[PDB]
Amino acid sequence: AIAQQWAIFRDKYFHPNGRIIDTGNSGESHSEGQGYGMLFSAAAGDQAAFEVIWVWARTNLQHKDDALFSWRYLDGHKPPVADKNNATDGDLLIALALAWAGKRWKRADYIQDAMNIYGDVLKLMTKSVGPYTVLLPGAVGFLTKDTVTLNLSYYVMPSLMQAFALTGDAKWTKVMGDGLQIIAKGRFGEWKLPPDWLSINLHTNAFSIAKGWPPRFSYDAIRVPLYLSWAHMLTPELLADFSRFWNHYGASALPGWVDLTNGARSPYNAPPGYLAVASCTGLASAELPTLDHAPDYYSAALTMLAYIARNQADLYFA
Numbered sequence: 001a002i003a004q005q006w007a008i009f010r011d012k013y014f015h016p017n018g019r020i021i022d023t024g025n026s027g028e029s030h031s032e033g034q035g036y037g038m039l040f041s042a043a044a045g046d047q048a049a050f051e052v053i054w055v056w057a058r059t060n061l062q063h064k065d066d067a068l069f070s071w072r073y074l075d076g077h078k079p080p081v082a083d084k085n086n087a088t089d090g091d092l093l094i095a096l097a098l099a100w101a102g103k104r105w106k107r108a109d110y111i112q113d114a115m116n117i118y119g120d121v122l123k124l125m126t127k128s129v130g131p132y133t134v135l136l137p138g139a140v141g142f143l144t145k146d147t148v149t150l151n152l153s154y155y156v157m158p159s160l161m162q163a164f165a166l167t168g169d170a171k172w173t174k175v176m177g178d179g180l181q182i183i184a185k186g187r188f189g190e191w192k193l194p195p196d197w198l199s200i201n202l203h204t205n206a207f208s209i210a211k212g213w214p215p216r217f218s219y220d221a222i223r224v225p226l227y228l229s230w231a232h233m234l235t236p237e238l239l240a241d242f243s244r245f246w247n248h249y250g251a252s253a254l255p256g257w258v259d260l261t262n263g264a265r266s267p268y269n270a271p272p273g274y275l276a277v278a279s280c281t282g283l284a285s286a287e288l289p290t291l292d293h294a295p296d297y298y299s300a301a302l303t304m305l306a307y308i309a310r311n312q313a314d315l316y317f318a
Contacts, residue, residue, distance in 0.1 A: 018056030035093030243282025273302025
């Protein structure tokens with residue numbers, strides 16, 4: 001149950017000033033982490049926590065000249081938020097959490113906050129690429145005159161759906177629909193999996209695995225099947241492909257990464273958060289792991305996302 005799992009997450013990673021901090025990377029907070037804290041506390045109904053997590057993120061990470069968020073606060077760096085680059089998944093997670101909080105607690109200011117973020121994602125983080133409108137992963141380091149790099153796991157599909165519900169802007173429909181087209185096509189290797197990082201050539205529209213990171217399905221890409229399932233956008237074709245992958249390795253041996261150019265897998269197995277995702281997307285036979293057994297912060301956050309997607313309590317924020 002979400003409130004009980006949030007209580008475990010909160011005990012481990014929440015601080016009274018509103019910061020979410022991974023105990024194993026104790027000198028930083030991220031926009032994605034504040035977004036998770038806000039999303040989980042909104043889903044669990046913990047308004048006292050939500051309020052301080054949002055105030056901390058707004059005060060320390062939100063930009064002056066737009067509504068997006070600097071990706072990291074680095075303790076002891078002078079100044080602590082020296083890199084102003086954003087991470088679009090953090091922006092979209094924070095916006096979704098504000099939308100949920102504003103609906104459940106009747107707070108029009110939280111709805112306005114969400115709409116300000118969504119407006120700037122649409123304005124600053126979309127680009128026309130070939131026949132598509134794409135969602136950029138951040139302002140710096142992903143777009144050149146020759147190629148665009150996309151992170152398909154930054155298509156936080158329930159957040160894009162919320163943005164359309166709030167605005168009625170048909171461009172959100174185009175971003176989502178082109179995203180599904182890109183995900184269908186940008187799959188690689190013997191398992192036909194999406195990469196952590198995709199490249200589209202701006203002069204030819206050819207798709208490839210992006211240079212600059214190992215050519216893997218791993219810690220980013222494993223969100224993709226989760227967001228597609230959660231948003232009811234996972235096609236039969238794709239569900240069958242993910243199911244074949246999970247069941248080849250089995251619940252006891254899911255890989256932490258798979259190389260999409262040669263099929264090599266990590267020697268070690270994935271954390272329980274991957275099992276949570278697989279259980280929602282075709283693994284035989286699907287109950288969710290609990291956070292008291294989480295080996296690390298990454299796994300705990302991914303497992304919580306799976307609890308929210310499963311929505312056993314059948315809550316809908318409106």
